[PDB]
RNA sequence: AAGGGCACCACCAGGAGUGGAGCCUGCGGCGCGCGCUACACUGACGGAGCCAGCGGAAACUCCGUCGUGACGAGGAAUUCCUAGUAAGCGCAAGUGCGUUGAUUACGUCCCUGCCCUU
């Protein structure tokens, strides 16, 4: 029961994948704690820590991507799982719970939904 | 816990409190009426790295993170254009040094200088009928502050040069000496005679 | 020193100046009561903080 | 003793800048300065330059300031401000000619160069620097203009007044005649020094011997 | 004469420079312009990490080693300029491309110009 996204910066572009699973975080093949800009690292933790690291228990997320530069890639992840994250609320779970996930969202910035 | 860990560290400071580098944002004042809705200090933030556009309205700019506004100002003299992933570094780094100068919030440290940093009667240069005399203007608060951050990183870059020290350093050692008063401060000792001046044109 | 701050009302809309330089109707903010007009420097809309050591000075066109 | 320069922008210290300062080369197919004495006939001839050709003046200022135990010392440094706009730093060791024809042949070289360089050090001598002088100078420095129609001082005591981290630099028209405003745009006030009107050298021995006195020198 | 307007070949507030050295190259003449290479620790060297677009690149990141040991950062002048831009960076192609990525302006008619109407 999958759903994608894909999020976009400058030169670079991201894949997500959505299904519902074990709660695990993949960056090309690769778990999210190796993310090497390496003082950008926060920055994509951000979709986890705006939200709760609770509904990330169900789900997974494997991404991949290709292109750009060294900040173009991290910009484009944490859009992509931002996206991804409320697609899947929104289509497998209550309506409500794709708002608030929306306007929480919103609420600490606008690059995670509009490119 | 999920599939791939995630640390301690990381899921505690995170969810819980959003804070700096990791440093509070919570109880850092303002302490200037005025300046405040200029120094951004509210909306908390991790790192200051904020890819956001404040160019395109007039004062979008105050919206911006006095933190990251500070990390956007050292990037200069075209040898150090774009590099701002330096800036953030040095950044995270000063703040460190100045907390171990002070504990306090080095990002209360770094309000302050920028606080008691703006100038209050700057001088325009009025006609005067050909040996010019300059007249005593007083000076918008989003100009304070944008000046501040120009005096204390020219400061800082300019301040140590050839020297044994780092621009880290250097600018913990302006923010430090600017975040008190007490003439050794580059920025202060400037903004005392900027001011000297206007009450000379009154 | 006696540091007063004050709040704009009215930006003038004519005026005539030097370059830079703009004349600004204030509040007072100790008391709603005096209104002065003023010289700011840097670009100012309405509603802010001023920081004013001079209390009077009644300036005019520069 | 560390030699005073611009670059420095901390130290307490005395600052003369000879302004109005007339350095010119003359042509001729060598190079001079213009001067008084070869040059009243033609300076005349144009209707112009009439004592705007006195480079002795600052020559004489200058073996004054630099001979002067306060240079010695280490807590003065000067500066030159010519009438045509070009603004002078003087390394204080540097021991300047003593005649002024040995004098012209340097200055006409300076001028023409930019800067004066040690044969043998790295740091110059006399190098040509850009205005205004206002950037050039310490942070907290009192800034005064000489003058004979100013409130007369005695130097000793207007210097114990300085700040304990203020510099004080001094103003010198070094020139025969003219309005004392050469200066009026950076001065905070002006300054006489005597009841009779003094030579710009003579204002300069005036002004260090004071310095000299309230500093403790000897 | 009057009232409006527009403009960094204007002003109000900065950036990047140019005008300095040698050399390359064009122009003049028998001085001028575009450039290249330059005068460290915000670095250099060694590992290591490792990311483009137009048709596993470099800057960069981390961990280490080194430790301050003509031209010494450019006169009077003066050009251009408001966001993925300036600058930095390298890449393909015979001008384009992306990577890193800003400070300042968005204002006015005080000045110098022009325009309009009276």
Same mark, same amino acid.
């Given at each position: 029961?999958?759903?994608?996204?894909?999020?976009?910066?400058?030169?670079?572009?991201?894949?997500?994948?959505?299904?519902?699973?074990?709660?695990?975080?993949?960056?090309?093949?690769?778990?999210?704690?190796?993310?090497?800009?390496?003082?950008?690292?926060?920055?994509?933790?951000?979709?986890?820590?705006?939200?709760?690291?609770?509904?990330?228990?169900?789900?997974?997320?494997?991404?991949?991507?290709?292109?750009?530069?060294?900040?173009?890639?991290?910009?484009?992840?944490?859009?992509?799982?931002?996206?991804?994250?409320?697609?899947?609320?929104?289509?497998?779970?209550?309506?409500?719970?794709?708002?608030?996930?929306?306007?929480?969202?919103?609420?600490?910035?606008?690059?995670?939904?509009?490119? | 816990?999920?599939?791939?860990?995630?640390?301690?560290?990381?899921?505690?400071?995170?969810? @819980?409190?959003?804070?700096? /580098?990791?440093?509070?944002?919570?109880?850092?004042?303002? !302490?200037?009426?005025?300046?405040?809705?200029?120094?951004? %200090?509210?909306?908390?933030?991790? %790192?200051?790295?904020?890819?956001?556009?404040?160019? /395109?309205?007039?004062?979008?700019?105050?919206?911006?993170?006095?933190?990251?506004?500070?990390?956007?100002?050292?990037?200069? *003299?075209?040898? *150090?254009?774009?590099?701002?992933?330096?800036?953030?570094?040095?950044?995270?780094?000063?703040?460190?040094?100045?907390? %171990?100068?002070?504990?306090?919030?080095?990002?209360?440290?770094?309000?302050?200088?920028?606080?008691?940093?703006?100038?209050? @009667?700057?001088?325009?240069?009025?006609?005067?009928?050909?040996?010019?005399?300059?007249?005593?203007?007083?000076?918008?608060?989003?100009?304070?502050?944008?000046?501040?951050?120009?005096?204390?990183?020219?400061?800082?870059?300019?301040?140590?040069?050839?020297?044994?020290?780092?621009?880290?350093?250097?600018?913990?050692?302006?923010?430090?000496?600017?975040?008190?008063?007490?003439?050794?401060?580059?920025?202060? !000792? !400037?903004?005392?005679?900027?001011?000297? %001046?206007?009450?000379? *044109?009154? | 020193?006696?540091?007063?701050?004050?709040?704009?009302?009215?930006?003038?809309?004519?005026?005539?100046?030097?370059?830079?330089?703009?004349?600004?109707?204030?509040?007072?903010?100790?008391?709603?009561? &005096?209104?002065?007009?003023?010289?700011?420097?840097?670009?100012? &809309?309405?509603?802010?903080?001023?920081?004013?050591?001079?209390?009077? &000075?009644?300036?005019? &066109?520069? | 003793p560390?030699v005073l320069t611009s670059?420095?922008?901390?130290?307490?210290r005395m600052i003369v800048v000879l302004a109005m300062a007339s350095l010119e080369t003359?042509?001729?197919?060598?190079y001079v300065l213009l001067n008084?004495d070869?040059? $009243?006939?033609?300076?005349?001839?144009?209707?112009?330059?009439?004592? +705007?050709a006195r480079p002795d003046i600052t020559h004489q200022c200058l073996l004054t300031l630099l001979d002067s135990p306060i240079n010695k010392a280490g807590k003065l440094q000067v500066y030159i401000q010519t009438s045509?706009?070009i603004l002078i730093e003087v390394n204080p060791t540097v021991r300047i000619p003593r005649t002024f024809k040995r004098f012209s042949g340097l200055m006409v070289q300076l001028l023409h160069k930019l800067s004066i360089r040690s044969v043998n050090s790295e740091e110059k001598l006399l190098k040509v620097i850009?205005?205004?002088?206002?950037?050039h100078?310490?942070?907290?420095?009192?800034?005064?203009?000489? =003058?004979?129609?100013?409130?007369?001082?005695?130097? $000793?005591?207007?210097? +114990?007044?300085?700040?304990?981290?203020?510099?004080?630099?001094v103003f010198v028209g070094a020139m025969?005649?003219?309005?004392?405003?050469?200066?009026? +745009?950076?001065?905070? +006030?002006?300054?006489?020094? =005597?009841?009779?009107?003094?030579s710009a050298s003579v204002a300069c021995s005036?002004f260090c011997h004071?310095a000299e006195?309230?500093?403790?020198?000897?």
């Open positions: 029961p999958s759903v994608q996204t894909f999020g976009k910066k400058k030169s670079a572009t991201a894949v997500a994948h959505v299904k519902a699973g074990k709660g695990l975080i993949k960056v090309n093949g690769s778990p999210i704690t190796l993310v090497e800009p390496e003082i950008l690292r926060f920055k994509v933790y951000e979709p986890l820590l705006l939200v709760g690291l609770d509904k990330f228990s169900n789900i997974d997320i494997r991404v991949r991507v290709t292109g750009g530069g060294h900040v173009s890639q991290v910009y484009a992840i944490r859009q992509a799982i931002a996206k991804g994250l409320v697609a899947y609320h929104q289509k497998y779970v209550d309506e409500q719970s794709k708002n608030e996930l929306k306007k929480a969202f919103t609420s600490y910035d606008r690059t995670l939904l509009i490119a | 816990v999920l599939a791939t860990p995630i640390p301690e560290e990381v899921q505690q400071a995170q969810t @819980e409190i959003k804070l700096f /580098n990791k440093w509070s944002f919570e109880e850092v004042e303002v !302490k200037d009426a005025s300046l405040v809705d200029y120094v951004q %200090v509210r909306q908390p933030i991790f %790192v200051a790295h904020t890819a956001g556009r404040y160019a /395109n309205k007039r004062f979008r700019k105050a919206q911006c993170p006095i933190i990251e506004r500070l990390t956007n100002s050292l990037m200069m *003299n075209g040898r *150090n254009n774009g590099k701002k992933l330096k800036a953030v570094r040095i950044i995270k780094h000063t703040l460190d040094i100045i907390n %171990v100068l002070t504990d306090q919030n080095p990002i209360q440290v770094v309000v302050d200088a920028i606080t008691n940093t703006g100038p209050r @009667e700057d001088t325009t240069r009025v006609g005067g009928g050909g040996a010019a005399r300059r007249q005593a203007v007083d000076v918008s608060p989003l100009r304070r502050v944008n000046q501040a951050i120009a005096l204390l990183t020219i400061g800082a870059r300019e301040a140590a040069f050839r020297n044994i020290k780092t621009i880290a350093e250097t600018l913990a050692e302006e923010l430090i000496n600017a975040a008190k008063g007490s003439s050794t401060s580059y920025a202060i !000792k !400037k903004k005392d005679e900027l001011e000297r %001046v206007a009450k000379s *044109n009154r | 020193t006696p540091v007063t701050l004050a709040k704009v009302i009215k930006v003038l809309a004519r005026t005539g100046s030097r370059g830079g330089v703009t004349q600004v109707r204030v509040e007072f903010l100790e008391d709603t009561s &005096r209104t002065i007009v003023r010289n700011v420097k840097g670009p100012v &809309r309405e509603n802010d903080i001023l920081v004013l050591m001079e209390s009077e &000075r009644e300036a005019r &066109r520069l | 560390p670059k420095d922008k901390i130290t307490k003359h042509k001729i197919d060598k008084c070869d040059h $009243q006939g033609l300076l005349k001839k144009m209707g112009r330059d009439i004592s +705007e045509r706009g850009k205005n205004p002088i206002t950037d100078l310490p942070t907290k420095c009192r800034k005064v203009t000489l =003058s004979f129609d100013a409130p007369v001082i005695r130097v $000793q005591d207007y210097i +114990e007044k300085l700040d304990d981290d203020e510099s004080i630099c025969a005649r003219g309005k004392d405003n050469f200066a009026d +745009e950076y001065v905070d +006030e002006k300054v006489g020094l =005597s009841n009779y009107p003094l005036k004071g006195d309230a500093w403790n020198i000897l």
